[PDB]
Structure 1
């Protein structure tokens, strides 16, 4: 069953996930002790970002290089072995990888995949929940899973906030941070909350989960790609899942 958390909801921010409400969130740790996020999308597959998979590594690395160096946790502290990794054939515009597990994970109250959406929910103003294992205000990996509520931001406002102009040949890097996000038609942006909380180092790979009250179902509308959107820049940038749905179904079928 997709998108039916047992306890539905009512990062340097707040909102500790105390009762457990995001059973699709996974915490991957690299060989050199960095924690990032990943999102269980069915009983055997998870979504993450290419950059997450390329940590600890040279800008030249393959799938068989990366696969044995990863460690992956679901639920609270249950280690799960990874079978393989499939990078998206593109990375200049999409920043996505799929992880395949050796065996099917048992589904329960604490571990359950999020459902993939059939509608485009990324309308301006919609408030989504981002859960993450990332760094807090002290830039230390958080001890407990947390989440924030963020609204989807205007794409053009975001483009202007990061790049000089929206016109391609007029663009110049204006990123308040060192690393530049990937911006194109496959991505959307999202502003922080109103008590000034946002995502930061290590949150990438997490799902922008939207709770559809009409069906009471949670949908992965985005996958956080640019996780440097700490309280210095304004918007995090996410890859639209609707724009990779076909590729996901295909990769799963094969």
Structure 2
């Protein structure tokens, strides 16, 4: 019924979609709500589910997932924007497209077996398992999925930074 974009779509690639009516919560349909704290600490291994291209670049007909660990957000920027100093920043993304990097992003590298996310996986959730509470929380939303196996870091939009804005839109 409605497709709401972010007020700053050039800084946070996030958009909310409203359905006409509520969807029944079956065993194959279940919402995942927002965390109260930040799980984007280096070493937090999270699961990413994807509907995008596979190693043959054809869209997958089955849902797949892979564990990706969060990475230090200095070597991610230096790998993409050349340096952490704004004056010396130059576009050197090994895929030819510059990711949108700022304080509302965190980068997750490849898995142990050299797995990553190619095109068509944007909008997916970087879900982490809170073993103490046994609940799945969304810590990031995939934004720059064009890295595939060439680059070494995928850019995810932090959920906590947009938690305040998401609640306001839902209320209306």
User: Could you state the TM-score of these two structures normalised by the residue count of structure 2?
Assistant: 0.99
1:225 to 143, 147, 151: 143
Q: CA deviation at 1:92?
A: 1.7
For residues 155 and 212 of structure 1, what CA distance do their matches in structure 2 show? 22
Q: CA deviation at 1:240?
A: 0.4
After superposition, the C-alpha distances for 1:176-225 in whole angstroms (9 at most, x for unaligned) are 01111000000010101010111011000000001100000000100000
For residues 91 and 148 of structure 1, what CA distance do their matches in structure 2 show? 28
Q: 5+ unaligned residues in a row in structure 1: which ranges?
A: 1-82
User: Could you state the TM-score of these two structures normalised by the residue count of structure 1?
Assistant: 0.67
The CA RMSD measured in Å over matched residues stands at 0.6
Residue 114 of structure 1 aligns with which residue?
32
For residues 213 and 177 of structure 1, what CA distance do their matches in structure 2 show? 36
Residue 15 of structure 2 aligns with which residue?
97
The aligned length equals 172
1:15-164 matched pairs, under 5 angstroms:
83-164=1-82
State the SS of the aligned residue for 1:107.
Answer: coil
The list of structure 1 runs, each at least 4 consecutive aligned residues, that deviate by more than 2 angstroms after superposition, is none
Q: CA deviation at 1:89?
A: 0.7
Q: CA deviation at 1:118?
A: 0.4
State the SS of the aligned residue for 1:144.
Answer: coil
For residues 104 and 164 of structure 1, what CA distance do their matches in structure 2 show? 46
